[PDB]
Amino acid sequence: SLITQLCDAGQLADYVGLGWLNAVSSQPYLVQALGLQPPPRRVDVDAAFRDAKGLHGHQPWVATPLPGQTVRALFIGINYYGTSAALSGCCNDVKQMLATLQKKGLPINEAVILVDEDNFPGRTDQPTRDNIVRYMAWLVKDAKPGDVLFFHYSGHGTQCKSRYDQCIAPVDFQKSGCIVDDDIHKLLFSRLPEKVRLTAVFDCGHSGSIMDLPFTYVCSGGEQASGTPHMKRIREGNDVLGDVMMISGCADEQTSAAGGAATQCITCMLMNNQSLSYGKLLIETRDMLKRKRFKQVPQLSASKAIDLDQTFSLTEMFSVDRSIQ
Ligand SMILES: [Sm+3]
Numbered sequence: 141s142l143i144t145q146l147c148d149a150g151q152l153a154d155y156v157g158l159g160w161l162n163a164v165s166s167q168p169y170l171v172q173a174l175g176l177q178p179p180p181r182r183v184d185v186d187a188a189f190r191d192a193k194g195l196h197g198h199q200p201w202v203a204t205p206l207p208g209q210t211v212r213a214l215f216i217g218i219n220y221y222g223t224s225a226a227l228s229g230c231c232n233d234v235k236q237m238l239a240t241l242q243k244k245g246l247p248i249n250e251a252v253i254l255v256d257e258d259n260f261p262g263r264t265d266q267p268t269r270d271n272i273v274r275y276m277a278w279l280v281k282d283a284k285p286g287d288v289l290f291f292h293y294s295g296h297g298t299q300c301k302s303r304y305d306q307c308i309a310p311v312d313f314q315k316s317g318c319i320v321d322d323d324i325h326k327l328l329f330s331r332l333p334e335k336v337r338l339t340a341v342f343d344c345g346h347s348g349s350i351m352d353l354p355f356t357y358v359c360s361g362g363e364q365a366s367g368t369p370h371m372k373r374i375r376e377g378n379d380v381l382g383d384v385m386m387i388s389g390c391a392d393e394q395t396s397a398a399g400g401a402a403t404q405c406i407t408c409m410l411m412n413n414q415s416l417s418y419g420k421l422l423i424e425t426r427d428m429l430k431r432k433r434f435k436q437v438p439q440l441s442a443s444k445a446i447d448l449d450q451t452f453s454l455t456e457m458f459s460v461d462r463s464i465q
Pocket residue numbers: 305306321322352
């Protein structure tokens with residue numbers, strides 16, 4: 141069962157009530173580039189899954205359960221307090237993400253929140269290298285047909301040397317090193333079975349990766365509502381069985397005549413109440429970003445060529461655009 145009354149397990153967090161939807165900054169914040177990193181310790185997926193066996197999340201709010209589906213979620217926000225790598229807006233991104241999901245009544249069975257902000261209601265643990273890795277394995281490990289997964293990262297993205305690649309920096313990166321995108325892809329995407337939907341939001345400043353995903357679409361300045369966009373194949377081969385959807389920000393691909401963009405994109409998308417298609421919704425989001433003086437335009441990437449005429453959702457399997465090979 142899912143907890144449906146506030147008396148079941150007692151009082152649950154009202155994140156909207158704490159002002160996390162409308163009373164926090166939804167403006168860009170500055171992300172200073174971390175710079176080149178030494179080579180990371182590569183992920184041992186077996187150890188990751190081993191270390192994930194004891195772990196659980198909690199139900200963050202009551203909502204109406206979706207029949208035949210369970211929802212699990214992992215949220216990671218890192219402000220790197222006290223360091224030269226300090227960021228002002230990453231844990232705040234998680235705040236808005238959490239409030240937006242609540243406001244929309246996404247019925248999450250178990251959530252894990254890894255933030256470095258003190259006294260953050262519902263904080264599970266610190267976003268260390270070992271916690272990010274093991275909780276990533278936690279998120280995907282019990283995935284059965286019908287399951288819905290949600291992943292959110294706000295923090296530094298950077299490049300690191302190989303023994304270059306894109307990588308994200310845990311709060312303890314100084315001591316434990318970064319995590320390469322190859323390993324994130326292997327943990328979070330590669331192990332999903334068929335008929336499992338995942339949405340992953342990566343809000344990391346500069347490193348606008350798409351995590352080795354085969355399909356992408358960038359909603360650049362020249363796209364119009366009265367156009368018909370399609371995803372493109374940008375990588376040969378595919379190791380992802382499940383339905384993975386990734387939201388991130390990149391530089392405009394239109395030829396010309398930092399922090400918080402990916403989070404505004406997915407929150408604006410969700411807060412739009414009118415059941416728009418991926419395509420129409422991305423135009424509106426692109427306009428919102430330009431309005432609020434974001435550097436980035438929205439980028440949708442996926443493990444299949446999504447028909448962008450399909451309605452946007454967090455819970456549904458993809459309708460495939462057969463015209464994309
Ligand atoms: Sm890579």
